[PDB]
Scaffold this active site. Structure first.
Site, PDB file in Angstrom:
ATOM      1  N   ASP A  35       0.831  -1.200   0.000  1.00 14.89           N
ATOM      2  CA  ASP A  35       0.000   0.000   0.000  1.00 14.89           C
ATOM      3  C   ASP A  35       0.866   1.251   0.000  1.00 14.89           C
ATOM      4  O   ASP A  35       1.377   1.654   1.048  1.00 14.89           O
ATOM      5  CB  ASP A  35      -0.870   0.000   1.241  1.00 14.89           C
ATOM      6  CG  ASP A  35      -1.768   1.202   1.280  1.00 14.89           C
ATOM      7  OD1 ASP A  35      -1.860   1.902   0.237  1.00 14.89           O
ATOM      8  OD2 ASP A  35      -2.332   1.461   2.381  1.00 14.89           O
ATOM      9  N   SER A 199      -1.036  15.708 -11.780  1.00 10.75           N
ATOM     10  CA  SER A 199      -1.321  15.368 -13.174  1.00 10.75           C
ATOM     11  C   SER A 199      -1.584  16.638 -13.964  1.00 10.75           C
ATOM     12  O   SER A 199      -2.120  17.616 -13.429  1.00 10.75           O
ATOM     13  CB  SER A 199      -2.522  14.418 -13.225  1.00 10.75           C
ATOM     14  OG  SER A 199      -2.970  14.194 -14.505  1.00 10.75           O
TER      15      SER A 199
END
Ligand SMILES: COC(=O)COc1cccc(CN)c1
Ligand code: NA
EC number: 3.4.23.22
Length: 330
Positions: A35, A199
């Site tokens: 994770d 992004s």
């Protein structure tokens, strides 16, 4: 040193991925959920409340000649989905894919929440976010990656998750055979303890690319892609009959639909998520409503590039002094 381990979907939907991890001496192999959004290595154990164990493999420190109680240390963690666990701490030898760390903090669960109990396939978590998020008190502990880093050939790990197929986690090297084209690297903020990046925008299907900054985290321990409501609405507007259902808890769509792809920007590069990756199947067994793999982040506080996004790419988690994040198509 390096390590290389295969990671396998727990079910037919790719809800999560498990990777075998050797703990203790002789080795006890547990299948852990790696994770990148958390920083604890915790396991079902011989200490876990018996009614909260249902099929998991447990770590038994008393059978490990290298296990040491980390005296006084406790841990307690809550995840984005409302699940939680807590317990005490041992140090032991931990190996992943042939890469060994001695003296790793292995957080032994005394209590786990129902979502963990109900998932017989996941024996614990191996956190790969920054060690600043580790919950051990009163002495915070390092992640497996942070403990391994100085021994690695290169201070990196890579995630290559499969779509309905196994994939790979590598430590200490970048497999140049595992991706196509070039890797595009992008800056990371460690301020929140995450692999947090920005992004450069998105496109829906064959639509035009929208330049827009989207700040989010690369999180292998989150199934879906959580993005701003504007982006998510623009995606689902291209699917006949899709809607947000408060009863189900997100966007659903007719199982008869063909989903469009979703593209996200990494610098000037583009990662395309095929439409099929966004289909999470019937909301209940036999339903003709299907659950979407792109959901709004508005109720979170953070955008999350979870497995739906990451499995479309070869992802480099660069833990050099200035961390960065690389993405390549594959
Ligand atoms: C793997 O289980 C899930 O993906 C549950 O949904 C989440 C949604 C957001 C954040 C998190 C934290 N990882 C989980
Ligand atoms: Na669900």
């Amino acid at each position: 040193s390096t390590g290389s381990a295969t990671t396998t979907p727990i079910d037919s939907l790719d809800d999560a991925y498990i990777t075998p991890v050797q703990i203790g001496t002789p080795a006890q192999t547990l299948n852990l959920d790696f994770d990148t959004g958390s920083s604890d290595l915790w396991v079902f154990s011989s200490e876990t409340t018996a009614s909260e164990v249902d099929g998991q493999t447990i770590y038994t420190p008393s059978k490990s000649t290298t296990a040491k109680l980390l005296s006084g240390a406790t841990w307690s963690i809550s995840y984005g989905d409302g699940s939680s666990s807590s317990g005490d701490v041992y140090t032991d030898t931990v190996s992943v894919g042939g890469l060994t760390v001695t003296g790793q903090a292995v957080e032994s669960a005394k209590k786990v929440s129902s979502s963990f109990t109900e998932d017989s396939t996941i024996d614990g978590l191996l956190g790969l976010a920054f060690s600043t998020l580790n919950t051990v008190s009163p002495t915070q502990q390092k992640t497996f990656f942070d403990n391994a880093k100085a021994s690695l050939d290169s201070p990196v790990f890579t995630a290559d998750l499969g779509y309905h197929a196994p994939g790979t986690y590598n430590f200490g090297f970048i497999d140049t055979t595992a991706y196509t084209g070039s890797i595009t690297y992008t800056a990371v903020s460690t301020k929140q303890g995450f692999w947090e990046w920005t992004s450069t925008g998105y496109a829906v299907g064959s639509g035009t690319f929208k330049s827009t900054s989207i700040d989010g985290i690369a999180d292998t321990g989150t199934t879906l892609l959580y993005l701003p409501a504007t982006v998510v609405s623009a995606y689902w507007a291209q699917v006949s009959g899709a809607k947000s259902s408060s009863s189900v808890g997100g966007y659903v769509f007719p199982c008869s639909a063909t989903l469009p792809s979703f593209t996200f920007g990494v610098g000037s590069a583009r990662i395309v998520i095929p439409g099929d990756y966004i289909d999470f199947g019937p909301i209940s067994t036999g339903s003709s409503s299907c659950f979407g793999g792109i959901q709004s982040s508005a109720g979170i506080g953070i955008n999350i590039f979870g497995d739906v996004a990451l499995k479309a790419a070869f992802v480099v988690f660069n833990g050099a002094t200035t961390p960065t994040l690389g993405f390549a198509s594959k």
